[PDB]
Every structure is written in structure tokens, then in C-alpha cells.
């Protein structure tokens, strides 16, 4: 399997050969096999595990899109992607949880709640 993992700002994997990539498509966890069928899936926020044989680097991910090319390539495009090694020492998640969801502005403060209480699920 070949991979293009691209971010706006950073560019993690470009063209190289990761053997298996895990993803969070809408209502479907995909583990992209070396020779998978052409798919175009929307990536919810979550962990994008790239496996390089006996290896794995998880990345928490903003969102984005994954497409499996007819040449069996994987194109994972996201806004934000960081290795777990230094993702979070803050812990102002609950400082946003009750801050957003408790306000009845209304359209989007409520909308900013749906993700945060889901993001810290690890």
C-alpha cells in the first residue's frame, strides 16, 4: 500500500509505502488493506493509525476525507494531525463541555459541544 497523508500546514506521508492504515469513516471503522476497493469516505475526528508492518503511529485528527484510488492508493487529507507523544497536558475539556452545552450564539455554542465530549475518548 502507498500513502499520501496531507495537511494544510504539515505533510506527514507523501508517496511512501505504509502497509495498513486505520481510519474513522462515518459509521464505519476502516482498516485499509494493501489492495482495497476504491472508496470515498468522510473522516470524523478520531485516531488515524498508520501501520508500517510491526509498527503503528496513532494521530488524533481534526477531520477531513479519505479516498481509495483505483491504483489502490490511500489519500488521507486532514486539517490537524499530531502524534500522541505530546498531544495534551492542558485538560480544559470539561472547561468547554459545561461551558458550551449549558448556554441555550445559540446555534453554534451548542454545536461546539457535540465534538468535545466525544474527542477525549482515550
Amino acid at each position: 500500500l502507498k500513502l499520501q497523508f496531507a495537511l494544510p500546514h504539515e505533510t506527514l506521508y507523501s508517496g511512501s509505502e505504509v502497509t495498513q492504515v486505520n481510519l474513522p469513516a462515518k459509521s464505519g471503522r476502516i482498516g485499509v488493506l494493501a489492495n482495497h476497493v476504491p472508496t470515498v469516505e468522510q473522516l470524523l475526528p478520531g485516531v488515524v493509525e498508520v501501520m508500517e508492518g510491526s509498527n503503528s503511529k496513532k494521530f488524533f485528527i481534526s477531520g477531513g476525507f479519505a479516498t481509495v484510488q483505483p491504483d489502490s492508493q490511500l489519500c488521507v487529507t486532514a486539517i490537524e494531525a499530531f502524534p500522541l507523544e505530546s498531544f495534551s497536558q492542558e485538560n480544559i475539556k470539561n472547561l468547554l463541555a459545561e461551558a458550551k452545552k449549558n448556554v441555550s450564539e445559540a446555534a453554534e455554542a451548542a454545536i461546539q459541544v457535540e465534538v468535545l465530549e466525544n474527542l477525549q475518548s482515550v
Binding site: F5, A6, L7, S14, P38, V40, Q42, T77
Partner: protein, 268 residues
């Protein structure tokens, strides 16, 4: 003629020459920064456009939305002017387009020529390197206040930074929700017919590829400002040398003349 007048003219020139010789270096401070966001930009182009390449996505021929990208900040050679060229050139083959201008210098370049067309305008831009947050919100307002997803065609206009020494105003399409479906090889993909992948992918792409243009246009500008200030502070330097001769002469004739005036005042 007067030493005062020559003193002021020499100062405002050398001052200009600090201004420009620093903007020349504030550019090079920003020069490496410009290649980060430039290759990273062209990198997602290869990643995100390859879908559309493969789906054979093309314009349904079934009223255009033209989006021009520059900046609010001037003093960058002809970044603004020759993008305005290529947008006018394009506005001859379809005069009736709506114009959305991102950046204040392309706004007024185009407001001079086709003031009826411009129908939304984004400000406070050139200041930093471009971001998805900017893109996505300008995108969101494009969907909301502009009804982007009803257009037969959507066009992005930016300058593509060919070299470090030259740039090239280019144009790129954005295909809407419908246009993504009726692409020939769209079927090649096992897109789950459940969610409107065509809607979300359009919205995601519109934001995503504005940022690519923005990142690229941004980079080319930095190089134009590097080069323009390279010339400005060299001209200014040349002026300084000339005027430093004129100052020094007037310096002296002012001492001479005062002395002759005094020496004459005791001729008696």
C-alpha cells in the same frame, strides 16, 4: 536651494531607504516561512485533487461565481495588477459573473473596472500566512450569504508562484454537489450512497482549495515584495549618493556665503 530644504530632502530619502531595505529583509525573514506553506499547499493539491482527476469530474453545462485572491497589503510589484489582468481577460468570455474579492488591493483594482460585479469582499487578510480557519469561514459565508452551491461554475483566481524570481496568475475550478455526482467515473468509487458525500466533499473542497490558492498567492507575494523592495532600496540608495553630493555642496556654499557676508561687513 536652501540647506534646510536639502537637509530635509536627504533625510526623507534615507528614511524611505530604511523602510524599503527593512521590508526587503522582513520579506526574507518570511521567505523560508513562505516555502513551508507553499509546498505543503501544492502537496494537498496532489492529495485532494487526485480524486477529481480520477472521477473525470467536469463542469455540467446545465452564471459564474468568480473568487479572486490577493491581499490587503500593497507594495509588492504587480501582484495585484496582473491578477486583475487575467481576471478581466476571463471576464470577456463570460461578463455576467459574480465577483468575490479576498484582499483589498484586488478589490479596488477590480472595482475600478467592473464595480457592478463585486458582490462580497473579505478584509484583514495579507497579514499572516493563510489558514484553514480563515478559508473555512470565508467558505461558510460563501455558502450562506452567496449561495455558492447553486452556481453552474465556480472559479478561484490566484497567483501561482512559479519561481522565487517570477509568478504566474492562474485559475482553478471548484465543482459543486451536483457536478460531483454526474462525473463519468464517479461510479468507479464505492461511495456510500447514504450521506451526501457530494455535498460535504464540495463544502470541504471549497474551503480546502481556497486555502491552497491563498497559501500559494501568499508565497508569490512575499517574493514580489522581496524583489520590489530589492529595487526600491537600491534606487533610494542611488538617490542618497547623488543628494549627499548636493547636501555637501550646499553645506559649503552656506559656510562660504556667511563668511563673505561677515568679511564684507568689515570692509569699512
Amino acid at each position: 536651494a536652501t540647506l534646510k530644504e536639502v537637509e530635509m530632502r536627504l533625510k526623507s530619502i534615507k528614511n524611505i531607504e530604511k523602510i524599503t531595505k527593512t521590508m526587503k529583509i522582513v520579506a526574507s525573514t518570511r521567505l523560508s516561512k513562505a516555502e513551508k506553506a507553499k509546498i505543503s499547499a501544492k502537496k494537498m493539491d496532489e492529495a485532494e485533487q487526485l480524486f477529481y482527476k480520477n472521477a473525470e469530474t467536469k463542469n455540467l453545462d446545465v452564471k459564474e461565481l468568480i473568487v479572486a485572491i490577493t491581499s490587503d497589503k500593497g507594495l509588492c510589484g504587480s501582484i495585484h495588477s496582473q491578477l486583475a489582468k487575467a481576471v478581466r481577460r476571463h471576464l470577456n468570455d463570460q461578463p455576467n459573473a459574480d465577483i468575490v474579492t479576498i484582499g483589498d488591493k484586488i478589490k479596488m483594482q477590480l472595482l475600478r473596472t467592473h464595480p457592478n460585479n463585486i458582490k462580497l469582499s473579505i478584509n484583514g487578510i495579507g497579514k499572516d500566512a493563510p489558514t484553514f480557519q480563515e478559508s473555512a469561514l470565508i467558505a461558510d459565508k460563501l455558502l450562506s450569504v452567496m449561495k455558492a452551491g447553486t452556481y453552474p461554475k465556480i472559479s478561484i483566481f490566484y497567483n501561482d508562484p512559479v519561481s522565487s524570481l517570477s509568478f504566474e496568475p492562474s485559475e482553478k475550478p471548484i465543482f459543486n454537489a451536483k457536478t460531483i455526482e454526474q462525473s463519468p467515473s464517479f461510479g468507479k468509487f464505492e461511495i456510500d450512497t447514504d450521506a451526501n458525500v457530494p455535498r460535504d466533499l464540495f463544502e470541504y473542497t471549497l474551503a480546502n482549495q481556497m486555502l491552497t490558492a491563498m497559501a500559494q498567492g501568499y508565497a508569490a507575494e512575499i517574493s514580489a515584495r522581496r524583489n520590489a523592495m530589492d529595487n526600491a532600496s537600491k534606487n533610494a540608495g542611488d538617490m542618497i549618493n547623488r543628494y549627499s553630493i548636493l547636501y555637501n555642496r550646499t553645506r559649503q556654499a552656506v559656510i562660504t556665503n556667511e563668511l563673505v557676508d561677515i568679511i564684507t561687513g568689515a570692509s569699512s
